[PDB]
From Swiss-Prot:
Residues of the full protein shown: 400 to 487 of 1096
Lineage top rank: taxon: Eukaryota
Job of this protein: RNA-binding protein that regulates the translation of specific target mRNA species downstream of the mTORC1 complex, in function of growth signals and nutrient availability. Interacts on the one hand with the 3' poly-A tails that are present in all mRNA molecules, and on the other hand with the 7-methylguanosine cap structure of mRNAs containing a 5' terminal oligopyrimidine (5'TOP) motif, which is present in mRNAs encoding ribosomal proteins and several components of the translation machinery. (Microbial infection) Positively regulates the replication of dengue virus (DENV).
Disulfide bonds, paired cysteine numbers: none
Name of the protein: La-related protein 1
Assembly behavior: Interacts with PABPC1/PABP. Interacts with EIF4A1. Interacts with RPTOR. Recruited to the active mTORC1 complex via interaction with RPTOR. Inhibition of mTORC1 activity strongly reduces interaction with RPTOR and the mTORC1 complex. Identified in a complex with mRNA, PABPC1, EIF4E and EIF4G1. Found in a complex with PABPC1 and SHFL.
Source organism: Homo sapiens
Amino acid sequence: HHHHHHSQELLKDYIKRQIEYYFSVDNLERDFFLRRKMDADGFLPITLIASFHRVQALTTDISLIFAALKDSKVVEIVDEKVRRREEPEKWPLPP
RNA sequence: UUUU
């Protein structure tokens, strides 16, 4: 009972900014590991993003990660997966 | 092994 909605708002903002960095053009131009994990439509499992060190440092609460991304104009969520909103299909690469 |  030490968990409170108000005391996760800043954490959500740090998570949102971190994940928006992964899906930035600047990062995607060099992030071959991430692109090699994408499906042909650009989607990645949100749980894969949650495992990355800078996200995992901030939280292991998957609801907070989902909430942080509903707040984003950079990414699109469908069910368990997330992709860049703009031209996602340009980025996938063979595994 | 990773600002994957």
